[PDB]
Design a protein around this nucleic acid. Structure first.
Lengths: 225, 109, 4, 128, 216, 62, 124, 34
RNA sequence: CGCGUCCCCCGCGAGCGCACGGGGUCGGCGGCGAUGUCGGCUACCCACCCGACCCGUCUUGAAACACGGACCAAGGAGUCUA
RNA sequence: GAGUGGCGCGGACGCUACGCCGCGACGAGUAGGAGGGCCGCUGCGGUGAGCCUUGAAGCCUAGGGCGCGGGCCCGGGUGGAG
């Protein structure tokens, strides 16, 4: 007589609506807690540095955990050992960018391609605009644009990464599930640097753009993003 | 009564050295000789007015011989008050060094 | 049920 | 009072010129009908600047406007009145076209029927 | 039953309200505002009676129709659009109509109409320009403003009054409406010396005069 | 400019049988439907085998 | 069955006419006149035809009967509808929906009938 | 979804700081008058 | 931000409407039109700017001071059997 | 998911399934390989109640077009039997 079907099908419709709101609140509060964490992280690096200066000692801050490697040289006339490493870093095209976590095994893979890459230690804001503007998820081996959180919740939710902010937190603060969340990101198709490069061929230290730009990759991310 | 358009010379096409892109023209507007001064002229309507053999209809009049290719100043070319313009027909090279009329008709003041 |  | 098509979109064409054959200008023995140059040193084959263009698949017309006439219809070629009733249901999409070797008296039948069935004809005044 | 209150959160920036949804819950008082849980018209016939059909099913279908299209959101009609003015075009300002038959003429701005077109009366006495519309883009706003603030511009001369009805002959209404506004502005443009001569004169680009150079 | 090798980007398996026999080609229509619609991996293997050559589906003795 | 003798007819029938990147079927009971499984008018047990009358005026609606389908001379049962447009189109809608007779040809038949009624109307 | 709250707070803080800056400048003008 | 109940610290409310919200719409207009005018992209001729050496071939390398080709028509070269 | 218990006769389009639709990435190329041609030539079996002296083939064409192209279809002229 349908009155029970009509009522039951509306309860199901409603049960998924309240379930969304609860997820929508979690995603809201997770991001509010992350704002509190990035404050405390940024503020402690100042705090630690200050009390060291007050004592007359030095505070050597932690060697950085997270690099943003951009490929600056093209596809033509590249040594086989350099070819192999650049495609293990997923830098198969000029002005492609990937997040790479620093360890001993990674830093010797970034000196082997030094002429061909420009990398540094990206800012928090650099990780934001890269994940928001240029952020494409690798979903079913397809480059699909991060337009809803449920693209990120369906691939990465088993690692409790259920929204855009959870991904940004996992990259910037190199978490236990950095590998999976970073491999989820497609290598960033960045545009040519606006205002120009200094000199592609030579190393940054000798007035070029190749090699390690510690703080200074963020000047070029904002230029290229 | 008076002239309501500013004197621009069609200097040439947007080109490399060994490649020219005819879709964009390079205007030289009289008086403006820096990227500073060319802020006024961006988005302004600009006409290549010429006259041909056959009488073509004239809107708000009887058929004259005079014809137009209507363009738009797009942005500042170079460092010295040159300006790029883009026309509804790629300008003929007949007009290299000839007068086009950058109008104040799309005003912003 | 809380919003009843 | 011409027949209008159902929809009349913008027939955008990536090229309007013919892909004329390499050195069809120089010789009369060479027709304009395109042949891919397979010469070892051929400027056209190996894409030197300012040479004759080679037809790629890239120039391929939009599938929504492909084979579409300037009037917005596509041709269907019609030999008699029995091949018009084919089009009395694809009426606003496809226009009839009477074949060259169809007689003067038989066009007068086809054109007159096509007007009844509201079918557009590309050559309705072609013998008389 | 309830008259609509105007939104309690003031607009801080477009889209973002000034008050959070906890402050707004408080402001709306939703702590005491909680609630629990045609076609056929029978006409008689003079038989018996008939049941006539409102919106009867169609008599002709074409060989093919077009499919209903997807739904956008930000695409209003022109009646519902937001109308911009510049900071320069304020009531009283003297414009330079650039494009019209009245090209290069110095013309007094009255009011922004409800089509975004300016109402403009460079007095018919001086310019030979009537109660007329112009477009903002096709007008230079000059930094020469009369005090127009005291005038009574009639309501009835609106956008539907200047709309081309289809020989054009001047209605005796349009001559009365001219003079009623023309008589309020003309003694205010004479209060400023040498101004009526300026409005009578026409704007030209003479040699050396480059529009970018002259600020005005 | 991307450093990809296109040598193997085209997978060289059968989408359909090479045969024009209609009775097989109706059984393919039936298992085109059942393979992709049923969650059963059986129907995927049967469809896959209806494509294969005389030599790839050899005779099974009693 | 229909699905079998489609696989014979789909390409090599006498009624099939390919040219100008278009495909048509000149079959005596195809409403959309196009080479299609659904619209083919020889192959199904249930078939709706719509032709102009033996006179100049009206539409004949050809229903194919359920029973004798190896029996061409008695298989098609024809009924002339010579009424106003709205009732000619109504009768065809009732025939197809309220007999359940091949009810996915319901709209093609109406659009065809509508285009036949348009045809036998005097020109301006 | 929390971006809206963060932006509202940022704009409000900027407005309050600008008002404080204007007040400090007024105090400076009074000091210059003294 | 009901409370019927649970203990350490002391399962469907109804409406409406606005929109930075899953790819453009206008519920905005204005000119012109029968012997001079409109459109026609392509094609005929001409002009101008940029580019632009002559093909085939063997060759590490051809515009080559390498060879074959004055021009046009028709013919003209992986076949059949085992 | 299912069984015993506490008024108005209405609804676009589709699906040549060898078809239609969606999403992603990609595109140099000699020698060479493979595929698809509703590319073209000539004959044969079928087939189109095809076309044709009220003008076939062929040819010419500052005509109207279609296809990325191979090519093709229309107009106009010529021609006279396919």
């Amino acid at each position: 007589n349908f009155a029970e079907l009509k009522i039951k099908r509306l309860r199901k419709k409603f049960a998924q609506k309240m379930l969304r709101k609860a997820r929508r609140k979690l995603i809201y509060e997770k991001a509010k807690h992350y704002h509190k964490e990035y404050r405390q992280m940024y503020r402690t690096e100042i705090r630690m540095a200050r009390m060291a200066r007050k004592a007359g000692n030095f505070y050597v801050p932690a060697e950085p955990k997270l690099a943003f490697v951009i490929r600056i040289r093209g596809i033509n006339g590249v040594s086989p050992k350099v070819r192999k490493v650049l495609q293990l870093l997923r830098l198969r095209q000029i002005f492609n960018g990937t997040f790479v976590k620093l360890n001993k095994a990674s830093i010797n893979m970034l000196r082997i391609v030094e002429p061909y890459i420009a990398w540094g230690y990206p800012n928090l804001k650099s990780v934001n605009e890269l994940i928001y503007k240029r952020g494409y998820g690798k979903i079913n081996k397809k480059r699909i644009a991060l337009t809803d959180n449920t693209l990120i919740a369906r691939s990465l939710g088993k690692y409790n990464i259920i929204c855009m902010e959870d991904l940004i937190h996992e990259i910037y603060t190199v978490g236990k599930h950095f590998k999976e969340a970073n491999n989820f990101l497609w290598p960033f198709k960045l545009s040519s640097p606006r205002g120009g490069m200094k000199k592609k061929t030579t190393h940054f230290v000798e007035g070029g753009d190749a090699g390690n730009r510690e703080d200074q990759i963020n000047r070029l991310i904002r230029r290229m993003n | 009564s008076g002239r309501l358009w500013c004197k621009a010379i069609f200097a040439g096409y947007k080109r490399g050295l060994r490649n020219q892109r005819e879709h964009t023209a390079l205007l030289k507007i009289e008086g403006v000789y820096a990227r500073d001064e060319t802020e006024f002229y961006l988005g302004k309507r600009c006409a290549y007015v010429y006259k041909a053999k056959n009488n073509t209809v004239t809107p708000g009049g009887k058929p004259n011989k005079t014809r137009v290719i209507w363009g738009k100043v797009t942005r500042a070319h170079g460092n010295s008050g040159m300006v790029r313009a883009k026309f509804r027909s790629n300008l003929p090279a007949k007009a290299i060094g000839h007068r086009i009329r950058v109008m104040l008709y799309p005003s912003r003041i | 049920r809380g919003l009843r | 009072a011409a027949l209008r098509p159902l929809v009349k979109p913008k027939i955008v064409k990536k090229r309007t010129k013919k892909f004329i054959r390499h050195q069809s200008d120089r010789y009369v023995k060479i027709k304009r009908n395109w042949r891919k140059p397979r010469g070892i040193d051929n400027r056209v084959r190996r894409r030197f600047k300012g040479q004759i263009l080679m037809p790629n698949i890239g120039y391929g017309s939009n599938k929504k406007t492909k084979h579409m006439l300037p009037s917005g219809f596509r041709k269907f070629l019609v030999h008699n009145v029995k091949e018009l009733e084919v089009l009395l249901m694809c009426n606003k999409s496809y226009c009839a076209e009477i074949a060259h070797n169809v007689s003067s008296k038989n066009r007068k039948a086809i054109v007159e029927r096509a007007a009844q069935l509201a079918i557009r004809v590309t050559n309705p005044n072609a013998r008389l | 039953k309830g008259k609509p209150h105007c939104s309690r959160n003031p607009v801080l920036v477009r889209g973002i309200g000034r008050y959070s949804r906890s402050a707004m819950y408080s402001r709306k008082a939703l702590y005491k505002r909680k609630y629990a849980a045609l076609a056929t018209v029978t006409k008689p016939v003079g038989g018996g009676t008939r049941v006539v059909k409102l919106r009867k099913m169609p008599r002709y279908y074409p060989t093919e129709d077009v499919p209903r299209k997807l739904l956008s959101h930000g695409k209003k009609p022109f009646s519902q659009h937001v109308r911009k003015l510049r900071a320069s075009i304020t009531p009283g300002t003297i414009l330079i109509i650039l494009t019209g038959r009245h090209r290069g003429k110095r013309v007094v701005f009255l009011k922004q109409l409800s089509s975004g077109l300016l109402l403009v009366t460079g007095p018919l006495s001086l310019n030979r320009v009537p109660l007329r519309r112009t477009h903002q883009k096709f007008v230079i706003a000059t930094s020469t403003k009369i005090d127009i603030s005291g005038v009574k511009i009639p309501k009835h001369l609106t956008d539907a009054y200047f709309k081309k009805k289809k020989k054009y002959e001047i209605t005796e209404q349009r001559k009365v409406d001219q003079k009623a506004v023309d008589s309020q502005i003309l003694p205010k443009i004479k209060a400023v010396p040498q101004l009526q001569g300026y409005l009578r004169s026409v704007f030209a680009l003479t040699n050396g005069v480059y529009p970018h150079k002259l600020v005005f | 400019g991307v450093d990809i090798l296109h040598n193997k980007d085209r997978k060289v398996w059968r989408k359909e049988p090479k045969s024009q026999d209609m009775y097989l080609r109706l059984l393919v229509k039936l298992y085109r439907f059942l393979a992709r619609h049923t969650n059963s991996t059986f129907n995927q293997v049967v469809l896959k085998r209806l494509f294969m050559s005389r030599t790839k589906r050899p005779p099974l003795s009693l | 069955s229909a699905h079998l003798q489609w696989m014979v007819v789909r390409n090599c029938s006498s009624f099939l006419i390919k040219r100008n990147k278009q495909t048509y079927s000149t079959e005596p009971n195809n409403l959309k006149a196009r080479n299609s499984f659904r619209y083919n008018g020889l192959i199904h047990r249930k078939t709706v035809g719509v032709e102009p009358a033996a006179d100049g005026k009206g539409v004949v609606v050809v229903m194919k009967r359920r029973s004798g389908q190896r029996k061409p001379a008695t298989s098609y049962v024809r009924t002339t509808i010579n009424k106003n447009a709205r009732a000619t189109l109504s009768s065809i809608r009732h025939m197809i929906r309220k007999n359940k007779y091949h009810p996915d040809l319901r709209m093609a038949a109406i659009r065809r009938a509508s285009a036949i009624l348009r045809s036998q109307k005097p020109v301006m | 979804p929390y971006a809206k709250t963060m932006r509202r707070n940022t704009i409000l803080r900027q407005a309050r700081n600008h008002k404080l800056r204007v007040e400090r400048a007024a105090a400076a003008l009074a000091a210059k008058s003294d």
